């Protein structure tokens, strides 16, 4: 007896991530619209450009938090307590939004989910590898199955949560996200005690006695310096919300910038720079689906007969549809890796180029077919299949996605009804050209 040929413990972790992704993307599907609503009632005193910027920097901090969660679990608390307490924080963050509060609850909700996702997301994937020995060949199949559960939750969540918001309002809809995470906790807690190795209730590489102090010193210097920067900012008058967002943008971009300049000072690392740039730029476009495309859907689409948040379901839908195809394709000369990044960046560019057409053809004061966004997501997910689809590279994928959203925090403020065609054309064409450049550089990168 198995779970699709895999250890029974996989079903638990399958369902665990399935409901966490449910809570996350269900929230992402309506959070921007919710901020619009808080703005329209005068409760929240920001612009839509700022609200869009918040969404992007929100995502950036979540991925950045994922780079640290692996460390905390492996060295301090253990992977299983990390997943559990990570989930509790995630749940609380959604409960905060379900409460009878307004804009005041936003920062509290955001902080909880960032810390929570940081603990849970990288360690659930870790616990998946736990299910297998070193020798096991089923590993790639199990992770593929595990990925499928991730996409399932991301698919049904905007459908359920989005419809709930339409029927019973925002507070009820956010509570469904909280309930979704709660279900994941029940299955994880009681299912884990049956199938998970008790060895991972504790850290696998616990701090040696002499390691405690320097780690404590290192963290303290980071917090103090960060606190110091904020102090100076408020002194010189850079203390509006766009200022703090720019600070986090700088921090998010500085982290890979420093690590590169660190390692650079044989030099094949230099050859990874274009790949990392290509990764950042792709994630920038892909992550704008929940921000820019979510805005386009709500303002420019004939979606009068269905919840407009449902458009967020297209991303994991096309992933699930494309996956068995590419699974077959990579088994049936297979193109190199820098080539995949170059072509993947092109498809992302075409997705934005396509969106420039309806505005250029019909104008931007009317409403267009929902099929335009359908074709756009189909293009960028096609590009995803080439670039994105575990170990130590998990950090770089967390980093690349984090930097992209940080870049988005700046870029999405430029998007509006007046700048629609220009926004989609330039960045659309811009990504295609850099995809062409990467093709020219593709041969050198191979062999390094
Ligand atoms: C294989 C599927 C291919 C997917 C097709 C994607 C589109 C490709 C070319 C059109 C993009 C640029 C559209 C032109 C935008 C443009 O003309 O901007 C000025 C405008 O006229 C000002 O009003
Ligand atoms: C399959 C296509 C293969 C790739 C072909 C690439 C096509 C690019 C067309 C857009 C170029 C820009 C033209 C429109 C720019 C535009 O709208 O500018 C407004 C004004 O500058 C606002 O400042
Ligand atoms: C990828 C192959 C299939 C699609 C190829 C893309 C072909 C055309 C896309 C770009 C042009 C679309 C037409 C937009 C309208 C326009 O330009 O307004 C002209 C301006 O003077 C206003 O009066
Ligand atoms: C066998 C699968 C091969 C996969 C190739 C699929 C490629 C593209 C999918 C269909 C895209 C065509 C749509 C463009 C033509 C169009 O919009 O004209 C509008 C017309 O309807 C007016 O009413
Ligand atoms: C939030 C309600 C969801 C249901 C929770 C059950 C109620 C109480 C559990 C005891 C306290 C929690 C202690 C958990 C610490 C922990 O590491 O859990 C790893 C777990 O054994 C892996 O399956
Ligand atoms: C920790 C236990 C597990 C977690 C359980 C999930 C959390 C809350 C569930 C109920 C939410 C009810 C929310 C009530 C909606 C509300 O406040 O009012 C709407 C508004 O008035 C309609 O217009
Ligand atoms: C628990 C969630 C995160 C907690 C924030 C801590 C972050 C930085 C402080 C570093 C030292 C803290 C770790 C405690 C050291 C410790 O547990 O001792 C091990 C060993 O048993 C002694 O040799
Ligand atoms: C890896 C550590 C992080 C990297 C080191 C960072 C060093 C200094 C931070 C830049 C200044 C922060 C202040 C930015 C705020 C800002 O730009 O203000 C505009 C706003 O329009 C004013 O209202
Ligand atoms: C596997 C990747 C597949 C490639 C994806 C890209 C293909 C087509 C783009 C969307 C279709 C154009 C939009 C059609 C709009 C339409 O149906 O016209 C009625 C509406 O009322 C007019 O606005
Ligand atoms: C509307 C008119 C616009 C014209 C559109 C033309 C589209 C593609 C042509 C350039 C392709 C260059 C790609 C190959 C160049 C090259 O040197 O590639 C070596 C590389 O090492 C191989 O992997």
SS (H, E, C) 88-146: HHHHHHHHHHHCCCCHHHHHHHHHHHHHHHHHHHHHHHHHHHHCCCCCCCCHHHHHHHH
Q: How far apart are CA 49 and CA 36, in angstroms?
A: 10
Q: Is the CB of 246 under 6 A from ligand 8?
A: yes
Planar angle of CA 329, 332, 338, nearest 5 degrees: 60
Q: What is the CATH number of domain 1-448?
A: 1.20.1250.20
Residues 6+ apart with CB under 8 A from 354: 372, 375, 376, 379, 428
Do 121 and 83 meet the contact criterion of CB atoms below 8 Å apart? Answer: no
Q: Which atom of ligand 7 is nearest to the CA of 207?
A: 19
Q: Which ligand is nearest to the CA of 429?
A: 2
Report the separation in Å between the CA atom of 176 and the middle of ligand 6, taken as the mean of its atom positions: 8
Q: Which ligand is nearest to the CA of 375?
A: 9
What Å distances lie between residue 244 and 54, 55, 167, 238, 388, CA to CA?
10, 14, 35, 8, 30
Structure solved via? X-ray
Tell me the H-state helices in 237-370: 241-264, 269-286, 292-300, 314-329, 337-362
Q: How far apart are CA 120 and CA 87, in angstroms?
A: 6
Is residue 194 a known part of a binding site? no
Q: Is the CB of 368 under 6 A from ligand 9?
A: yes
In 3D space, the residue among 64, 80, 60, 306 whose CA is nearest the CA of residue 203 turns out to be 80
Which of the listed residues 440, 444, 447 should we mutate to test ligand 10's pocket, taking the one with most ligand atoms within 8 A of CB?
440
Tokens for 274, please give them: 């274009």
Do 216 and 36 meet the contact criterion of CB atoms below 8 Å apart? Answer: no
Q: How far apart are CA 52 and CA 37, in angstroms?
A: 13
Which of the listed residues 380, 419, 425 should we mutate to test ligand 1's pocket, taking the one with most ligand atoms within 8 A of CB?
425
Q: How far apart are CA 324 and CA 218, in angstroms?
A: 45
Do 165 and 173 meet the contact criterion of CB atoms below 8 Å apart? Answer: yes
- Domain boundaries along the sequence of the chain: 1-448
Q: Is the CB of 238 under 6 A from ligand 8?
A: yes
User: Which residue is closest in CA terms to ligand 6's atom 10?
Assistant: 175
Q: Is the CB of 371 under 6 A from ligand 9?
A: yes
Left, alpha or beta for 316 (phi > 0: left; psi -120 to 50: alpha)?
alpha
Report the separation in Å between the CA atom of 80 and the middle of ligand 5, taken as the mean of its atom positions: 9
Tokens for 389, please give them: 């689809």
User: Which residue is closest in CA terms to ligand 7's atom 8?
Assistant: 216
Which of the listed residues 354, 361, 422, 429 should we mutate to test ligand 3's pocket, taking the one with most ligand atoms within 8 A of CB?
361
Q: How far apart are CA 179 and CA 220, in angstroms?
A: 36
Report the separation in Å between the CA atom of 425 and the middle of ligand 2, taken as the mean of its atom positions: 5
Neighbours of 226 (CB within 10 A): 12
């Amino acid at each position: 007896k198995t779970f699709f040929g895999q250890p029974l413990g996989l079903s638990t972790l399958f369902m665990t991530e399935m409901w966490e992704r449910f809570s996350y993307y269900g929230m992402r599907a309506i959070l921007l619209y919710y901020m619009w609503f808080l703005i329209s009632t005068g409760d929240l005193h920001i612009t839509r450009a700022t609200a869009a910027s918040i969404m992007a920097i929100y995502a950036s901090m979540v991925y950045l938090s994922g780079t640290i969660g692996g460390f905390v679990a492996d060295r301090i608390i253990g992977a299983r307590p990390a997943v559990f307490w990570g989930g509790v924080l995630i749940m609380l963050g959604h409960i905060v939004l379900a409460l009878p509060f307004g804009a005041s609850a936003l920062f509290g909700s955001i902080i909880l989910i960032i810390i929570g996702t940081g603990f849970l997301k990288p360690n659930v994937s870790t616990l998946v590898g736990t299910l297998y020995d070193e020798h096991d060949r089923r590993r790639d199949a199990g992770f593929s199955i595990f990925v499928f559960g991730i996409n399932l939750g991301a698919f049904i969540a905007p459908l359920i949560v989005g419809a709930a918001q339409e029927a019973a309002g925002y507070h009820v809809a956010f509570s469904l996200a909280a309930i979704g995470m709660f279900i994941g906790l029940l299955v994880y807690y009681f299912g884990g005690k049956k199938t998970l190795d008790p060895h991972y209730l504790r850290p696998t590489d616990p701090l040696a006695p002499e390691e405690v102090k320097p780690l404590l010193v290192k963290v303290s210097l980071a917090v103090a310096g960060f606190i110091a920067i904020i102090v100076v900012m408020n002194l010189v008058g850079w203390n509006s919300l766009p200022a703090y967002i720019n600070l986090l943008t700088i921090v998010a971009i500085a982290i890979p910038v420093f690590y590169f300049a660190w390692m650079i000072s044989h030099l094949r690392v230099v050859s990874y720079i274009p790949l990392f740039i290509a990764a950042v730029l792709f994630w920038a476009i892909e992550e704008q689906g929940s921000v820019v495309l979510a805005t386009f859907a709500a303002e420019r689409v004939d979606s009068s007969w269905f919840p407009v948040s449902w458009f967020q379901s297209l991303n994991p839908l096309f992933i699930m549809l494309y996956t068995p195809f590419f699974a077959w394709l990579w088994t049936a000369n297979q193109p190199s890796s820098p080539t995949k990044f170059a072509v993947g960046l092109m498809f992302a560019g075409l997705s934005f180029l396509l969106m420039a057409i309806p505005g250029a053809l019909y104008g931007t004061s009317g409403k267009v077919s929902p099929l335009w966004l359908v074709g756009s997501w189909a293009l960028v997910i096609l590009g995803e299949m080439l670039i994105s689809p575990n170990s130590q590279m998990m950090s770089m994928w967390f980093l690349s996605s984090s930097v992209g959203s940080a870049l988005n925090a700046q870029l999405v403020t430029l998007y509006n009804a007046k700048s629609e065609v220009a926004y989609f054309s330039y960045f659309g064409l811009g990504s295609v050209v850099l995809g062409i450049v990467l093709v020219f550089l593709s041969k050198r990168i191979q062999g390094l």
